[PDB]
Amino acid sequence: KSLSAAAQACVKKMRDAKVNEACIRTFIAQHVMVSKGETGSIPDSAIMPVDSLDALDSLTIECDNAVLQSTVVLKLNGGLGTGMGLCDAKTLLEVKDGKTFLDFTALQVQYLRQHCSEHLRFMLMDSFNTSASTKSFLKARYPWLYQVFDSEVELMQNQVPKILQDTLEPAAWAENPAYEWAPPGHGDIYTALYGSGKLQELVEQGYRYMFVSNGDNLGATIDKRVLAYMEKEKIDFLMEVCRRTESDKKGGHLARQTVYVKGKDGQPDAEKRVLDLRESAQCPKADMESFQDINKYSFFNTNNLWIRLPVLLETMQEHGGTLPLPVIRNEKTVDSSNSASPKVYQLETAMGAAIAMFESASAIVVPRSRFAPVKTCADLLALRSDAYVVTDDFRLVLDDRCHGHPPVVDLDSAHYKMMNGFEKLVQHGVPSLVECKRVTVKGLVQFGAGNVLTGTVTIENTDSASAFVIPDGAKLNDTTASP
Ligand SMILES: O=c1ccn([C@@H]2O[C@H](COP(=O)(O)OP(=O)(O)O[C@H]3O[C@H](CO)[C@@H](O)[C@H](O)[C@H]3O)[C@@H](O)[C@H]2O)c(=O)[nH]1
């Protein structure tokens, strides 16, 4: 079929590698779009703010046991935390008390089975980058998961060809041909579910809902109220959003994309509010100050998502066996560390974007207990610290003393972006942050043993040659400390 010579080269390459067809049909529609100049840009001009949503904390109704039992849980596990200097799955980092993201995830599942739903179904979406390590970490530590890993747990995401910028042909990189390929973002979950046959298998088995969340978000868990809300309101797709803080910078905001709908009368013309997501990579830099404005776009996507599985299966079947999420065209070199390697486009989607694919879509505001993201080492420090606690059901959430506000941790990006620098900052121990509204570390620093930070603290070293090492036991309150 289609159509340009570049596109055909992509189809051939993909088929030769036995990539499944649903992934092929999806990639190619994106390629067609990109070849017409689509970048995935969503300018401010194209959207508006959303201002009223229901709040989860206002809801009280719980779903029945059959509804809960129809619910599958899936965790995202396919990216690497490269910004924090990681070359393997982020879920493998230790978060609290000598346990990793993966450990807590498994414990949350174990707890649900014991207490809540005996046969609860759990899935991990792995990529080629993360699959072997996840599988090995599991074999050792959660054998009940490892049995059934290949068979039931893992959803393997697609690989799609990186395409050359100049031609839109598939990239050649003879030094490492695997670098000619990448997982096409978390938006790929739908394609992978469908293409694998797993989606149909789940519907056949009688599962009706899927709850999906980021691997780095240990807050996120099944909530019976959400399920009940969905049933009562007949929602096919639901996005959990948090009221946006200062700290929410790596992510997406909820938006409204403007339409008036025809009720078998042309007279009027009330218009449905069609919700959408704008990712950071979708915002033209010119409009970036707007994107950053936490008043204007005050609802931030958690990536806690609810999907009514039959509706999804059907939507896809009828859209040619695909879900037509807006492509995001990233620019990279084929090898990330070689700046001179061929320039590419990497085509990706975001799973949140599916809010636009359903007539019955919405969003609900949720508390921070459901959202403890780790995108940065500063996030990691807070989570590691006493600000965060482990619940009976193995979630990590803020200590009650915090009152739902995470401590604002601002760490000098020069020194604490990479995992190594961060480990250095805390070589002598993680400070108490539970009482700290904001901590700012500027320049090169180390915490001492047993430090306690309260109120608003700035630790500043402008010397930059020697580490300001905080003395053991120091209590810092509403102060600037300096050498
Ligand atoms: O190809 C991919 C890319 C990512 N991931 C995983 O998806 C999760 C989220 O990815 P990450 O890079 O951490 O977050 P973003 O894609 O920037 O942002 C997501 O998470 C934010 C909340 O933390 C939301 O605001 C954004 O809208 C949502 O897209 C993590 O578990 C990743 O490992 C995959 O499985 N496959």
Could you describe the 3D structure shown?
Keywords: Nucleotidyltransferase, Transferase. It catalyses: alpha-D-glucose 1-phosphate + UTP + H(+) = UDP-alpha-D-glucose + diphosphate. UTP binds at residues 90, 157, 185, 216, 375. The protein has 483 residues and is α/β, with parallel strands linked by helices. 42% of the residues are buried. It contains 15 helices and 26 strands. The chain folds into two domains: 1-374, Spore Coat Polysaccharide Biosynthesis Protein SpsA, Chain A (Alpha-Beta Complex); 375-483, Hexapeptide repeat proteins (UDP N-Acetylglucosamine Acyltransferase, domain 1). The strands form eight sheets. Strands 1-17-11-14-10-2-5-6 form an eight-stranded mixed β-sheet. Strands 20, 21, 23, 25 and 26 form a five-stranded parallel β-sheet that branches. It starts with a helix and ends with a strand. The protein is 26% helix and 23% strand. The chain binds uridine-5'-diphosphate-glucose. Uridine-5'-diphosphate-glucose is lined by residues 76-79, 90, 125, 127, 157, 183, 185-186, 214-216, 250-252, 277, 279, 300-303, 350, 352, 373, 375.
